[PDB]
């Protein structure tokens, strides 16, 4: 029933459309969903998929460490 | 200090090919997407193409699809633009630019190269012909018409640079023949017409030609 | 999928609040940035952190740049930038120049030189010297007949001292055509005033 | 039991190291797996993940079809 990434109890749906953080977060909310939390995916196999996509805190999720206000990225919605 | 140095520009005939390069230093080159932007003489900025940080994704504006190919070499920190089937409308200053966002993204360009000029023309190098613009307590106007030269640029001075006040050297225009034309004028007191000599010095380095034209009153 | 910046040109004094608007035909996903470019130089990204005088505001079809306090360093051309569907696009651009009093051009007209006439081509040159504002309509008339498609114009940058402009217009004819007519006129229109300089061959 | 993409009984495991097609194909074979077949993913929701990665035929999987650098790849069919 999960057309995406299944991990524990959360299903992650990829939105391949590039959008700003504000538009991505609003788009997930329009589907009763939120952007991924970085601490719940950082140490898992999910990082290879969620890399460079929007995190819930307004920053891209990055494995190894600009203007995040108008940059545009892909994103997952979960929950 | 983020530095982007470009090279490979020049004059090329229509239908032939040219390859631009962009050497990057001062940042992690492999983590940033790179762009090429061009600006035709007297026109605005036009986005040309983007290559992703890892070189997988490439996108082009419609007018160059099938003719231009963007590429990058992350071990040499160099960006490339291979241009084929060049048309006269490809004449422009080409800039490389760095996205400031990291990884798979699109964002603003925070670092620009100095630009490199690309001129697509079938015309051959030719020095200019210089014709006088002869003047007729008033102020008099005189000048030189620098006509039919190729390629750009031409420098104009008056009296070996001794006359600078009131001098207007206009930007060159491209004539329909493919050769450039330019005018330089100066306003001087009309009483000076009998005593002062006015000479325009036209230097055309691409053809190793210099022309000095003494402009006399009618 | 048309992008326009209103106004294409504007004049302002040092210390003014300047607004440059850049619109789009539809939702364009996201506005990216504003850029400032001076003649001969590469464009420069505008940053809203320095107190920074630059501020951007984008609401769908509209993108606005605000320069809260203008210094002589801000006279340049400004371009918006946006991303939409795997492509980026710059706006047409807006030139911001230094405001001053209106100045009527000094108009001079030069017939072709005899040296050029011997080559078979005639260039008639019209000079508009030290005028303001930039907008001026130049028209060529030969025997009172309007000319079109056979002239080219060139304009200097705004001068550093008097902040005026100068313009040259060249009418190109063959030697044969030039000898078939008598009156050659260059008309310049600005506001409510038109000035025509002429000569008879 | 699938730490990747599950679609109609097949599990797709992402390998994030960039490899040539030959080494990507050998790496899947060393685990009794294969690279994805384009015909099995093209019209599905998998296409957004597997796009630009190696297909079994030696070409990258593209949405619309019609230059041999290293790429990421999925392995399936363990």
Residue C92 shares a structural domain with residue C9: yes
In chain B, the domains with their CATH numbers are 3-120 (2.60.40.10), 129-215 (2.60.40.10)
Give the 3-state secondary structure of chain A: CCCCEEECCEEEEEEEEEECHHHHHHHHHCCCCECCCHHHCCCCCCHHHHCCCECCCCCECCCCCCCCCCCEEEEEEEC
Find the closest chain B residue to A74 by CA distance.
B105
| Domain range for C115 | 106-200
C186 beta partners: C140, C197
Could you count the other beta carbons within 10 Å of the beta carbon of residue D29?
12
Single out the residue in C98, C122, C141 at which a domain terminates: C98
The CATH T-level fold of domain A5-78 is: Mannose-Binding Protein A; Chain A (3.10.100)
What is the C-alpha separation between B72 and B76, in angstroms, rounded? 9
Domain positions in chain A are 5-78
Sorted by sequence, the CB contacts under 8 Å of residue C181 that are 6+ apart come out as C142, C143, C201
Q: Does B45 touch chain A (CB under 8 A)?
A: no
B68 beta partners: B83
Could you count the other beta carbons within 10 Å of the beta carbon of residue C39?
8
Could you count the other beta carbons within 10 Å of the beta carbon of residue B21?
18
Single out the residue in C98, C114, C147 at which a domain terminates: C98
Three-state DSSP state, D21: helix
Sorted by sequence, the CB contacts under 8 Å of residue C169 that are 6+ apart come out as C125, C126, C128, C138, C140, C151, C152, C153, C154, C186
Run of H or E including D27: helix D21-29
Chain C positions touching A72 (Cβ under 8 A) are: 29-30, 32, 83
Lateral strand order in the sheet of B198-204? B155-158, B198-204, B209-215
Resolution value in angstroms = 2.2
CATH of residue C31 = 2.60.40.10
What is the C-alpha separation between B41 and B200, in angstroms, rounded? 25
Residue C36 shares a structural domain with residue C62: yes
Chains near D (3 or more Cβ pairs under 8 Å): A, B
Chain D positions touching A8 (Cβ under 8 A) are: none
What is the C-alpha separation between C154 and C169, in angstroms, rounded? 7
Strands B45-51 and A73-78: unpaired
Q: How many domains are there within chain C? A: 2
Cβ–Cβ gap B105/A72 under 8 Å: yes
- Helical residues (DSSP H) of C95-180, grouped into ranges: 114-117, 175-179
Query: Which residue's entry shows tokens 């009527």?
Result: C104
The angle at the Cα of A28, spanning A22 to A29, to the nearest 5 degrees, equals 85
Chains near B (3 or more Cβ pairs under 8 Å): A, C, D
Residue C155 shares a structural domain with residue C85: no
Experimental method used, please?
X-ray
Sorted by sequence, the CB contacts under 8 Å of residue C69 that are 6+ apart come out as C15, C16, C17, C53
Sorted by sequence, the CB contacts under 8 Å of residue B74 that are 6+ apart come out as B29, B30, B54, B55
At the fourth CATH level, the homologous superfamily of domain D5-75 is Mannose-Binding Protein A, subunit A (3.10.100.10)
Run of H or E including C33: strand C30-37
């Amino acid at each position: 029933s999960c057309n995406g990434l299944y991990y524990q109890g959360s299903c992650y749906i990829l939105h391949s459309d590039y959008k700003s953080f504000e538009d991505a977060k609003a788009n997930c909310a329009a589907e009763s969903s939120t952007l991924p939390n970085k601490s719940d995916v950082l140490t898992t196999w999910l990082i290879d998929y969620v890399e460079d996509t929007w995190g819930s805190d307004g920053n891209p999720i990055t494995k190894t460490t600009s203007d995040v206000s108008q940059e545009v990225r892909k994103y997952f919605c979960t929950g | 200090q983020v530095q982007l140095v470009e090279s490979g520009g020049g004059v090329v005939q229509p239908g032939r090919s040219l390859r631009l390069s962009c050497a990057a230093s001062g940042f992690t080159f492999s983590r940033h997407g790179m762009h090429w932007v061009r600006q035709a003489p007297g026109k605005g900025l036009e986005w040309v193409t983007v290559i992703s940080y890892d070189g997988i994704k490439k996108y082009y504006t419609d007018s160059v699809k099938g003719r231009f190919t963007i590429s990058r070499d992350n071990s040499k920190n160099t960006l490339y633009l291979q241009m084929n089937s060049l048309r006269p409308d490809d004449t422009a200053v080409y800039y490389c630019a760095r996205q400031d966002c990291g990884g798979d993204c699109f964002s603003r360009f925070d670092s620009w190269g100095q630009g490199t000029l690309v001129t697509v023309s079938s015309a051959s190098t030719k020095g200019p012909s210089v014709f006088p613009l002869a003047p007729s307590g008033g102020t008099a106007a005189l000048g030189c018409l620098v006509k039919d030269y190729f390629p750009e640029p031409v420098t104009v001075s008056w009296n070996s640079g001794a006359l600078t006040s009131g001098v207007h050297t206009f930007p060159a225009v491209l004539q329909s023949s493919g050769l450039y034309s330019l005018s330089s004028v100066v306003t001087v007191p009309s009483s000076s017409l009998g005593t002062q000599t006015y000479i325009c010095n036209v230097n055309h380095k691409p053809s190793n030609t210099k022309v000095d034209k003494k402009v006399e009153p009618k | 999928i048309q992008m326009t910046q209103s106004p294409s040109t504007l004049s302002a004094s040092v210390g003014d609040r300047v607004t440059i608007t850049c619109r789009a035909s539809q939702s364009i996903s996201s506005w990216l940035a504003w850029y400032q470019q001076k003649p001969g130089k590469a464009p420069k990204l505008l940053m809203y952190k320095a107190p920074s005088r630059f501020s951007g505001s984008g609401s769908g079809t509209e993108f606005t740049l605000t320069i809260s306090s203008l210094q002589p360093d801000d006279f340049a051309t400004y371009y918006c930038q946006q991303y939409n569907s795997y492509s980026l696009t710059f706006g047409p651009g807006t030139k911001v120049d230094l405001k001053r009093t209106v100045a009527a051009p000094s108009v001079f007209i030069f017939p072709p030189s005899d040296e050029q006439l011997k080559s078979g081509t005639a260039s008639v040159v019209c000079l508009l010297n030290n005028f303001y504002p930039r907008e001026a309509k130049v028209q060529w008339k030969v025997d009172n007949a309007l000319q079109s498609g056979n002239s080219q114009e060139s304009v200097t940058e705004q001068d550093s001292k008097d902040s005026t402009y100068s313009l040259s217009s060249t009418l190109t004819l063959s030697k044969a055509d030039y000898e078939k007519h008598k009156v050659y006129a260059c008309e310049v229109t600005q506001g409510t005033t038109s000035v025509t300089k002429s000569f008879n061959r």
